[PDB]
Design an enzyme around this catalytic site. Structure first.
Site, mmCIF file in Angstrom:
data_model
loop_
_atom_site.group_PDB
_atom_site.id
_atom_site.type_symbol
_atom_site.label_atom_id
_atom_site.label_comp_id
_atom_site.label_asym_id
_atom_site.label_seq_id
_atom_site.Cartn_x
_atom_site.Cartn_y
_atom_site.Cartn_z
ATOM 1 N N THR C 57 89.852 60.692 44.861
ATOM 2 C CA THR C 57 89.016 61.256 45.041
ATOM 3 C C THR C 57 89.238 62.580 45.906
ATOM 4 O O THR C 57 88.741 63.612 45.956
ATOM 5 C CB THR C 57 87.784 60.660 46.082
ATOM 6 O OG1 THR C 57 88.657 60.428 47.261
ATOM 7 C CG2 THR C 57 87.499 59.338 45.412
ATOM 8 N N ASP C 58 90.428 62.655 46.490
ATOM 9 C CA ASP C 58 91.191 64.020 47.321
ATOM 10 C C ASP C 58 91.315 64.911 45.941
ATOM 11 O O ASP C 58 91.205 66.103 46.212
ATOM 12 C CB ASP C 58 92.642 63.571 47.758
ATOM 13 C CG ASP C 58 93.054 64.766 48.648
ATOM 14 O OD1 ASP C 58 92.373 64.618 49.614
ATOM 15 O OD2 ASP C 58 93.893 65.250 48.229
ATOM 16 N N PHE C 159 38.800 65.754 50.865
ATOM 17 C CA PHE C 159 39.216 64.396 50.266
ATOM 18 C C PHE C 159 38.121 63.457 50.526
ATOM 19 O O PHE C 159 37.779 62.967 51.712
ATOM 20 C CB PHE C 159 40.608 63.736 51.080
ATOM 21 C CG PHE C 159 41.017 62.636 50.238
ATOM 22 C CD1 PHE C 159 41.250 62.680 48.929
ATOM 23 C CD2 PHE C 159 40.984 61.285 50.875
ATOM 24 C CE1 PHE C 159 41.692 61.586 48.397
ATOM 25 C CE2 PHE C 159 41.204 59.965 50.374
ATOM 26 C CZ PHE C 159 41.770 60.233 48.775
ATOM 27 N N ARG C 176 39.702 69.963 55.824
ATOM 28 C CA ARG C 176 41.181 69.029 56.664
ATOM 29 C C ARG C 176 42.349 69.878 56.542
ATOM 30 O O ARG C 176 42.190 70.933 55.782
ATOM 31 C CB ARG C 176 41.305 67.727 56.205
ATOM 32 C CG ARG C 176 41.836 67.788 54.846
ATOM 33 C CD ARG C 176 41.983 66.296 54.223
ATOM 34 N NE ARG C 176 42.928 66.349 52.781
ATOM 35 C CZ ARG C 176 43.331 65.299 52.240
ATOM 36 N NH1 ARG C 176 43.537 64.176 52.897
ATOM 37 N NH2 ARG C 176 44.162 65.566 51.104
ATOM 38 N N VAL C 227 45.818 65.761 47.383
ATOM 39 C CA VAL C 227 47.199 66.185 46.974
ATOM 40 C C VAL C 227 47.287 65.913 45.412
ATOM 41 O O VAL C 227 48.127 66.969 44.660
ATOM 42 C CB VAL C 227 48.194 65.305 47.761
ATOM 43 C CG1 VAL C 227 49.596 65.576 47.642
ATOM 44 C CG2 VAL C 227 47.912 65.902 49.246
ATOM 45 N N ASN C 254 52.074 63.383 52.718
ATOM 46 C CA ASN C 254 50.849 64.111 53.434
ATOM 47 C C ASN C 254 51.232 63.997 54.973
ATOM 48 O O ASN C 254 51.003 62.832 55.121
ATOM 49 C CB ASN C 254 49.542 63.289 52.785
ATOM 50 C CG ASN C 254 48.261 63.905 53.028
ATOM 51 O OD1 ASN C 254 48.386 64.687 53.724
ATOM 52 N ND2 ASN C 254 47.416 63.331 52.638
ATOM 53 N N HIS C 256 50.041 64.088 58.221
ATOM 54 C CA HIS C 256 48.575 64.162 58.925
ATOM 55 C C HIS C 256 48.490 64.791 60.113
ATOM 56 O O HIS C 256 49.403 64.886 60.934
ATOM 57 C CB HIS C 256 48.293 62.682 58.739
ATOM 58 C CG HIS C 256 48.424 61.943 57.696
ATOM 59 N ND1 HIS C 256 47.760 62.046 56.552
ATOM 60 C CD2 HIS C 256 49.247 60.590 57.252
ATOM 61 C CE1 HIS C 256 47.963 61.350 55.474
ATOM 62 N NE2 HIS C 256 48.773 60.446 55.968
HETATM 63 O O1 LIG Z 1 90.670 53.625 48.264
HETATM 64 C C1 LIG Z 1 90.619 54.735 47.704
HETATM 65 N N1 LIG Z 1 90.056 54.832 46.497
HETATM 66 C C2 LIG Z 1 90.154 55.779 45.751
HETATM 67 O O2 LIG Z 1 89.326 56.124 44.788
HETATM 68 C C3 LIG Z 1 90.563 57.277 46.457
HETATM 69 N N2 LIG Z 1 90.795 58.408 46.274
HETATM 70 N N3 LIG Z 1 91.442 58.862 47.247
HETATM 71 N N4 LIG Z 1 91.851 58.012 48.161
HETATM 72 C C4 LIG Z 1 91.113 56.935 47.764
HETATM 73 N N5 LIG Z 1 91.291 55.809 48.497
HETATM 74 O O1 LIG Z 2 45.155 63.752 49.313
HETATM 75 C C1 LIG Z 2 45.003 62.537 49.681
HETATM 76 N N1 LIG Z 2 45.365 61.625 48.672
HETATM 77 C C2 LIG Z 2 45.446 60.460 48.760
HETATM 78 O O2 LIG Z 2 45.561 59.613 48.167
HETATM 79 C C3 LIG Z 2 44.787 59.900 50.161
HETATM 80 N N2 LIG Z 2 44.658 58.913 50.798
HETATM 81 N N3 LIG Z 2 44.310 58.990 52.281
HETATM 82 N N4 LIG Z 2 44.365 60.354 52.323
HETATM 83 C C4 LIG Z 2 44.379 61.081 51.248
HETATM 84 N N5 LIG Z 2 44.783 62.451 50.978
#
Ligand SMILES: O=c1[nH]c(=O)c2nn[nH]c2[nH]1
Ligand SMILES: O=c1[nH]c(=O)c2nn[nH]c2[nH]1
Ligand SMILES: O=c1[nH]c(=O)c2nn[nH]c2[nH]1
Ligand SMILES: O=c1[nH]c(=O)c2nn[nH]c2[nH]1
Ligand code: NA
Ligand code: NA
Ligand code: NA
Ligand code: NA
EC number: 1.7.3.3
Lengths: 295, 295, 295, 295
Positions: C57-58, C159, C176, C227, C254, C256
């Site tokens: 990974t290094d 809504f 709202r 929404v 959303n 509120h």
């Molecule tokens: O345990 C490790 N896995 C790896 O793939 C790795 N690559 N760099 N260091 C590491 N250490």
């Molecule tokens: O825009 C909304 N969508 C929803 O599904 C909803 N449910 N409560 N309030 C809401 N407002």
């Protein structure tokens, strides 16, 4: 115009360190993210394009790795103090270093009831942090913290008796869910320098453990009158257990879980004593802070 | 133009449910995020502004809460199957329901070595997930997974013997750090309907536990020749332990930790056998996938 | 057990390229994140620890930088096709390459009404993406997309007329807010290889621009019945404007915005025709999808 | 133990407001996230479980919506001052309010070169923010800021002449990429109360626009000797243009783009004058701060 304040440095420096025990073959890993910001006689880099006063942020990054190579990285209070002290001692014109460390969890795996010698799991995004401010002539100020400790209790939380006026719609309650993400910080008494920090090294891990234990036990056991009241109980216990702490600060969100009234659907009962299904609220959230010190 | 495919529904529906034991006073919490998308004879809502065929997404949200109120929410394979079946049975013109559930961890706290009756901690962002596709006349297809399981081993990983050409700079190694975030999915044989899913209910939690245990043990114990080789060992073990699984898919990042050469600084030795301090790399990362089935 | 499917490679490869015009002094920057996954005769790396079949990974990472050095990186459809073709041609046993590119916006700054020669701003997190699948003997399949285009209209969305039953609480509405994050994908007819992709190079940027323009204009001008109905209008227009597109897929949340009833406070009117202040909801959200093709 | 400091309130309160012009039919939207934290004689809620002193955080949330209904929400400096003043005037025992507002961009769409009456686009995650501290008897302190303004220049940035010692590996350079995310804060002189804030209302939007314009122009035009030097030029210009500002603070990451040496591959030249392809680094990053005030 004039430079009133300036600090600069390197943020987001990821560091891993492994310790290998010769005798036992046991390995222990530490992983942290470190930030170091410096202050001192650096105004001319801003005002006169004078780069001669700049310790490059790239060099600060190098210093962090070198310091981690040559010193213990635990407890983080010690490592941060070593790192901050290095900068103020090495560079005449640098007078303050601000070191922030975030410690990531790598907890040893149990495989078949036995601790594994070299395999670890990230059990939660809870962090242990330190902020260390090393200021030339003024010693070392350390704030230790835990953050990202997420908890929930499903009962034994109440909230009633609050102020009611024309802005109030909240019902009083004697049974609610309480959930929070704990951020707790304890501030140490000022240390005179590195020798004094070294002298207290065992207290750092012990106090972290105490802070975590007190937080979990108090949260679980308090029949909470409010976040305010429960957090105060936590803070007063930590202060009682460690005399070298000056203040404890908690910052707690109140992550709300709302009842869902389903009575419009076939008289389904889902409120009060019948509440089973709740809607966790992503926002807004209460935010409660307090700093507790000694009388 | 014509509608070739359409699905719609509600995503990110957060649900919490508490179970309270009458006798023992023990409470158990479940928290999930649910997505439900429907398909069927709904083309005219898109092409003719005919909303009469639309079960409102808001109603889908209501249905999720009502269904959680009236049914067990665990194992999630069962809850998802109940929820998907509801839509295809209730609405003549809806012919497929696609239900995705993410289960969040709330692990019971231990306080003083005793499990607490109603206090919980989020121990890691590891998730247990299900994808349930309920298709009218074609039964119930369930894919179960774990994700966000982050592990690291500090030795007993190798990578040598790969292809070398003019694009290759990587050195072969016999000792490296291996860290990954595990995403593992097992696909169940098709179920004929809800009665058959109910008949296998105990297998769901047991197979999840097996998949997790096999993943952790194999990672910890394999002297890994590559991510490819270790992941295959995991998959073949899961297939051997549960005959009702048809395929196992793993998707593993290779989260690189680089050696830091410090020899430019006072000859400090920090590579190969002397490597102690490493730089975790945020990006790029290897990504290795495989799907393993039966011969 | 047997390997049913396998792919591996490097993800999250960040690439920046600058073009410098000799004559004018104008510079143009491109920044992308690239993922390349390979498939082929690689099963033995999984089953037999045979690394000889693995392009590290290094090395994949190196190849991405080398390819960007030697070729245009725009349009991304072309770059992805060049990159994918490289792997299947260079390595006998690699038979498919899957290339995903995300293009980040760096828009030239206007300073005093004049375009700046070498300064750029990230104007939004909208992305232009490509997915290129290069499969030996089967040509090149390209899906182009835009994502992260966040829009809102404050009126001219309705809504009403949806299914009402015992699960329904949603009120019908004739006015709202409608807000969404647009994800739109157009799938090109299969190309026979790189020569054919090169022959259509001008169509790629033009079709992206058309898709974006049709999306914005239709959203702004449609008196939206749902929404579903508005998204269909967008898709049918794109298909009409570019004959080399086979399908268009939209995926729209959303997002509120809820009315806030304030009538409990001094009869304050904030609903229906009097609605001024709304509460944006972070979750849940509606999710509406459709794929539109040719008759 | 004693409460040394306490504040509490509501965070993450999302608010949308629409203004509808009667005559023209033009609509304008505002969306913000608001945090309000209160201080005052509230210690007993922490120490004695006395909730009578607590204005519930839920009531604070209600107040934010009511205040937005009854007042202009723009400029945010004004809205924050109104909101903070409300709390200290309404509640005898509340003595400070801290209001943080983040304003989200909803920019009117241009459709066919004409501004649309009611359709908007989120053009970037750049924010305009305010922090307002209202303290009883001490007036109103306002810090205004912009954040999340992400820019890059591909040349005309240098960095040489810095301190070199045994910790230094960074090469001096006369031509590099400079990219940052701008965080800029200007602090107003203290205002005596709401009447004085109202008197300066036109200055708030004008100063924001000036700060943004000065930031962009200076970044684009300065042949930068360092982040430090360029940021100082920005700050001194803002202070010169608005006499009611006391200090300007910038906080700038240095988001590094590294050269990639490709010379190992067929002598390919990609460094120095031949550098075309670079590797953006996610971490670590330089972090440079400065606060500039008047002589
Ligand atoms: O345990 C490790 N896995 C790896 O793939 C790795 N690559 N760099 N260091 C590491 N250490
Ligand atoms: O825009 C909304 N969508 C929803 O599904 C909803 N449910 N409560 N309030 C809401 N407002
Ligand atoms: O502009 C810069 N300022 C600095 O302080 C610095 N340090 N390394 N590179 C840098 N670039
Ligand atoms: O514990 C709580 N503290 C509060 O200050 C508060 N306000 N609303 N709910 C609350 N819960
Ligand atoms: Na010093
Ligand atoms: Na049906
Ligand atoms: Na091939
Ligand atoms: Na007051």
């Amino acid at each position: 115009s004039a430079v009133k304040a300036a600090r600069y440095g390197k943020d987001n420096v990821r560091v891993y360190k492994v310790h290998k025990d010769e005798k036992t073959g046991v390995q222990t890993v530490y992983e942290m993210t470190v930030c170091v910001l410096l202050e001192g006689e650096i105004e001319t880099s801003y005002t006169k394009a004078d780069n001669s006063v700049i310790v490059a942020t790239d060099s600060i990054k190098n210093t962090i790795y070198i310091t981690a190579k040559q010193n213990p990285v635990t407890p983080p209070e010690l490592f941060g103090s070593i790192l901050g002290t290095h900068f103020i001692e090495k560079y005449n014109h640098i007078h303050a270093a601000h070191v922030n460390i975030v410690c990531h969890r790598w907890t040893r795996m149990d495989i078949d009831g036995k601790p594994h010698p070299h395999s670890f799991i990230r059990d939660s995004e809870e962090k242990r942090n330190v902020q260390v401010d090393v200021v030339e002539g003024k010693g070392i100020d350390i704030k230790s913290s835990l953050s990202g400790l997420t908890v929930l209790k499903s009962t034994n939380s109440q909230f009633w008796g609050f102020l009611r006026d024309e802005y109030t719609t909240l019902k009083e309650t004697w049974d609610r869910i309480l959930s929070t993400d704990v951020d707790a910080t304890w501030q140490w008494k000022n240390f005179s320098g590195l020798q004094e920090v070294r002298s207290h090294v065992p207290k750092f891990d012990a106090t972290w453990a105490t802070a975590r234990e007190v937080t979990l036990k108090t949260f679980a056991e308090d029949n909470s009158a409010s976040v305010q009241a429960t957090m105060y109980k936590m803070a007063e216990q930590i202060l009682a257990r460690q005399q070298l702490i000056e203040t404890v600060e908690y910052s707690l969100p109140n992550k709300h879980y709302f009842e869902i009234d389903l009575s419009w659907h076939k008289g389904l009962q889902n409120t009060g004593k019948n509440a089973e299904v709740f809607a966790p609220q992503s926002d807004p959230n209460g935010l409660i802070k307090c700093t507790v010190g000694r009388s």
